[PDB]
Every structure is written in C-alpha cells, then in structure tokens.
Amino acid sequence: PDAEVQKNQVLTLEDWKEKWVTRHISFHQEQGHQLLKKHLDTFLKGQSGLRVFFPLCGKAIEMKWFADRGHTVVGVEISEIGIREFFAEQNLSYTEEPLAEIAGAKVFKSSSGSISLYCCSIFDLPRANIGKFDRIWDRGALVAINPGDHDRYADIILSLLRKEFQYLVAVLSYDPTKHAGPPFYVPSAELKRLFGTKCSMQCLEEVDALEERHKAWGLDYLFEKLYLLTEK
Ligand SMILES: Nc1ncnc2c1ncn2[C@@H]1O[C@H](CSCC[C@H](N)C(=O)O)[C@@H](O)[C@H]1O
Ligand SMILES: Sc1ncnc2[nH]cnc12
Ligand SMILES: Sc1ncnc2[nH]cnc12
C-alpha cells in the first residue's frame, strides 16, 4: 500500500547538515507560507504573549511574524548554518550559548530573547527542558522526519503541548512511488494515527501545489493540506 512505500527510506542528520553546507535548500519559502498567512490572525485571535514552537525550523521567516506580534518563539534545527542565516536574513542580533545536557549542541537567542533556536536534533530536545507551548506551526517538519521516526516525533510534539493548544500541521499528498522523500508522504490516515487519540482534527484547507520543479521529480499531482489540531 502507498502509505508504506517509503517506510524504510531515511535521510540522516549529517545528510541534512550537508544540504545546508552545499546549498540544497529548495524547501525554503522566501515569501513564507501562504496558508499560514491566511490563517494567522485566527491562529492567534484574542491572545497575546503565546509560546510558539517551530519543529525543524530551518530559517522559516514566519518565526519573525510571530515574534513581531509579541509572541515567544522556540525552534529546533540541526544545522547551525540555517540558524545563523535566519538571523542574518531577518536582521536580528543574537547570542550563542552551549547546552550542557546535549553534547556539541547550543542555543542562539535573539538579543531580547523573543526567538530561541536550539541547534540539536528534535529527538534530543526534551533534555534541553524547553517548557510547553500554546501553539505549534509544523511545515516541512513532520514531512521531513524519516517515516520510521513518526511515532517518536509525535510523542515529542505531544509532550511539548499545553492543555489548551492550536497545532497547525502542513502535509503533502503525491504518489510515493514517483518520489523518494523528503518531503515524505504523510496521508490523513497517518496524521489520525499519530495524533488522533490526543487531538481533535480539522482539515482547514487543501490547495493544488504542483509546479514545474515538481514535474522534475516526476510528479503529475501534488496537493498541500493544512490540518488544525486542538484539545479534545
Ligand atoms: N531530527 C532533526 N532535528 C532537527 N532538525 C532537523 C532534523 N531533521 C531535519 N532537520 C532540519 O529540518 C529542516 C527540514 S526542511 C524545512 C525547513 C522549515 N521548516 C521550512 O519550512 O522552511 C532542515 O532544515 C533540516 O536541517
Ligand atoms: S488557524 C485557526 N485556528 C483556530 N480556529 C480556526 N478556524 C479556522 N482556522 C483556524
Ligand atoms: S521539508 C521539505 N524538504 C524538501 N522539499 C520540501 N517541500 C516542502 N517541504 C519540503
């Protein structure tokens, strides 16, 4: 069945680091995610000072959209190059500090603390004691995790959530035989299976996402879907 075509495909931490060194970062959206933009006011309606977590954040420009609006932002990214590029691109000063609980890892914080980006693996993050969050934006994250690590990833995400929460996750649907991930194919049913017990799920959107750079992979279709998950 389609959903397990990719079951044993992996990209390692070192592979990701190398994509950044060599500049293979086609996943970055220079003008930021359009569905988040459309849904942002609602994601944030009537609250101020939320804690927002960005798994596998790369240099996502939407982190600056939350910090700008008075919210605290935490991200995790294996690549120091991506982390430093975010700060240079967003024109913010930052400090760098080692994390003792995680060997070789460190945290980069904007000068006034609004944005903290942990340079480590998401699987190691729990040892960094980062607290819990009201909000999670997940794009190019759950879809970049190796299929084999889905259950581990999902338990991390769930342990990072406060009792009341909004969790926006963006997934891609395409034919898994015609492209070896990332981005991996994460169907609705996989989402339901990982979070369905702890979260109510609502599909907010589903736009056609196919473009020339995708016909190149051999893709004849590509749909982007945005799910909102909240408490039960
Ligand atoms: N286990 C892991 N822990 C932390 N970062 C990881 C990771 N696996 C992959 N990454 C990083 O996660 C990113 C996924 S690509 C998408 C980046 C970002 N969310 C965006 O929308 O642009 C890459 O930057 C990769 O360096
Ligand atoms: S993003 C978001 N958050 C909460 N409720 C919603 N309804 C539609 N979009 C929503
Ligand atoms: S995470 C990721 N990696 C590569 N390409 C992508 N497109 C959308 N998300 C992506």
Beta-carbon contacts of 205 under 8 Å, excluding residues fewer than 6 positions away, are 35, 39, 224, 225, 226
Query: What CATH number is attached to the domain comprising 24?
Result: 3.40.50.150
Query: How far, in Å, is the centroid of ligand 1 from the Cα of 56?
Result: 4
Alpha-carbon distance values, 101 to 81, 108, 127, 157 (Å): 22, 16, 6, 19
Site to probe by mutation for ligand 3, drawn from 11, 20, 27 as the one with most ligand atoms within 8 Å of Cβ, is 27
Q: How was this structure determined?
A: X-ray
Query: How far, in Å, is the centroid of ligand 1 from the Cα of 58?
Result: 5
Beta strands in 28-132 (DSSP E): 51-54, 72-76, 94-98, 106-110, 115-119
Sign of the CA dihedral running 94, 16, 173, 207: positive
**Gap between the terminal Cα atoms of the chain:** 30
Alpha-carbon distance values, 163 to 31, 115, 151, 191 (Å): 32, 23, 20, 19
Q: Is the CB of 183 under 6 A from ligand 1?
A: no
Q: Is the CB of 182 under 6 A from ligand 3?
A: yes
As given in the structure block, the two tokens for residue 2 are: 């389609």
Other beta carbons less than 10 A from residue 195's beta carbon: 20
> In sequence order, what are the beta bridge partners of 37?
none
Domain that holds residue 58: 1-232
**Residue holding tokens 């760098």?**
96
Phi and psi, residue 56, nearest 5°: 55, 55
Helix (H) or strand (E) holding 192: helix 188-195
Q: How many domains does the chain have?
A: 1
Give the experimental resolution in Å.
2.0
Quick one: DSSP state of residue 184? P
> Nearest bound ligand to CA 171?
3
Q: For residues 173 and 222, is the Cβ–Cβ distance under 8 A?
A: yes
